[PDB]
Design a protein around this ligand. Structure first.
Ligand SMILES: [Mn+2]
Ligand SMILES: [Mn+2]
Ligand SMILES: [Mn+2]
Length: 430
DNA sequence: ATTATGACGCT
DNA sequence: AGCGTCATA
């Protein structure tokens, strides 16, 4: 009873940009605003590959990983912005720099964990305590939560969407006990007030809209964030978890979207997150391992302890290119030319990183894929990264992969390379 | 012929 | 270390 950990110790948010690369291009080019629009990479092959889609375009059924030629069949007036190409390859610098804009604003409110190019977790526990003390037991007005959904509400004894949101929010605020500074529901609510402020700052200062989730841990915050995209935020309380999870496919939870999630479904013969509660911790550990089993046992009850790491910067800087079909690299000079291209982009990004962030990478990882291999990577080798010099790095990368060439004579490369990848790792302060 | 990333876990 | 898994625009 009094000793059941309920995982309500923290307030955690996840802020995720809406259709992020599209918004970056729409800010740059006002003609793309409020239009069905997508961002594409390359063009020659089937119109290019779509990697981001505006919500207007999603209404036509356009998705990521769709060829633009096919997207145009669903949406003839679809507008397209192309990813920059430099040194023969897609270059994502504009989006990385836009990401930094957003991450630096979020960092003014709390220490953040950069989780992708367009999202970060925030531990708001401390900030909530201070806002609460400042609050002096004054109720939280609905006006402080103008874009917030309370998951699970309204419920019990209007056909418009904004009307429903307000009803739910009213029920939530009506039930709150603002008298108790240690009340988790209150703490989440104040967390949501801060995230409204955060999201307003991001939009004011960048032009970019985002969504967010507020809960007691990262997995619930991430899940919450997606519930009312775009341009809205969602509070998932501890109490909302049983109903929420009772019809939530297991694959929707972060980390369960792949083989593990499929094995949970197959081995246990269940479909929804909530169904996990009927297994003992030892039962889950027996099937999925000690760590996974303990994680599942707590997660299906709404509990997770994974901390928000204080890391705002990526800990690796990498450059990669596929060489699909018959563009696969079959000669030495080809392989060497592309290693140089990759190395030159890597040097440029590394040098900028050193100046901005007072650190130096010390290890170079070289990865290739060979024709026939289903795996993402066929081979990964490391060597020392001692100088930010593209020609040295590309020469070194070649040295480490030299022996993968099975051809008798050295001018040819066989079997042809379908992927090159250079990654700088192991940063030290400088 | 989705591609270009990036983090974390296992052994 | 090198490989595998999972994730995101
Ligand atoms: Mn996003
Ligand atoms: Mn995201
Ligand atoms: Mn996405």
């Amino acid at each position: 009873g009094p000793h059941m950990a309920t995982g309500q110790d923290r307030v955690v948010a996840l802020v995720d940009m809406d259709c992020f690369f599209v918004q970056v291009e729409q800010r740059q080019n006002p003609h793309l605003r409020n239009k069905p629009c997508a961002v594409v990479q390359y063009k020659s092959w089937k119109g290019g590959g779509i990697i981001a889609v505006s919500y207007e375009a999603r209404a036509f059924g356009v998705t990521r990983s769709m060829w633009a030629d096919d997207a145009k069949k669903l949406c003839p007036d679809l507008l397209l912005a192309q990813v920059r190409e430099s040194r023969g390859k897609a270059n994502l610098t504009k989006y990385r720099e836009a990401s930094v804009e957003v991450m630096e604003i979020m960092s003014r409110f709390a220490v953040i964990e950069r989780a992708s190019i367009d999202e970060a977790y925030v531990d708001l526990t401390s900030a909530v305590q201070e806002r609460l003390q400042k609050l002096q037991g004054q109720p939280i007005s609905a006006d402080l939560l103008p874009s917030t959904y309370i998951e699970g509400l309204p419920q019990g004894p209007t056909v418009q969407k904004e009307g429903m949101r307000k009803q739910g929010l009213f029920q939530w605020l009506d039930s709150l006990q603002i008298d108790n500074l240690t009340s988790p529901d209150l703490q989440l609510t104040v967390g949501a007030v801060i995230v409204e402020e955060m999201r307003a700052a991001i939009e004011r200062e960048t032009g970019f809209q985002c969504s967010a989730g507020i809960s007691h841990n990262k997995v619930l915050a991430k899940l919450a964030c997606g519930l009312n995209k775009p341009n809205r935020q969602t509070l998932v309380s501890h109490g909302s978890v049983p109903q929420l999870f009772s019809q939530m496919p297991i694959r929707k939870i972060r980390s369960l979207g792949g083989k593990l999630g499929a094995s949970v479904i197959e081995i246990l013969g269940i479909e929804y997150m909530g169904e996990l509660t009927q297994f003992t911790e030892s039962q889950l550990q027996s099937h999925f391992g000690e760590k996974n089993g303990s994680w599942l046992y707590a997660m299906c009850r709404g509990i997770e302890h994974d901390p928000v790491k204080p890391r705002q910067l990526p800990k690796t800087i990498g450059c990669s290119k596929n060489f699909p079909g018959k563009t696969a690299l079959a000669t030495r000079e080809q392989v060497q030319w592309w290693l140089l291209q990759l190395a030159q982009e890597l040097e440029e990004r590394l040098t900028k990183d050193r100046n901005d962030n007072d650190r130096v990478a010390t290890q170079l990882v070289v990865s290739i894929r060979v024709q026939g291999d289903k795996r993402l990577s066929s081979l990964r080798r490391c060597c020392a990264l001692t100088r930010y010099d593209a020609h040295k790095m590309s020469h070194d990368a070649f040295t480490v992969i030299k022996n993968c060439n099975t051809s008798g004579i050295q001018t040819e490369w066989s079997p042809p390379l379908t992927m090159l990848f250079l990654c700088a790792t192991k940063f030290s302060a400088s």
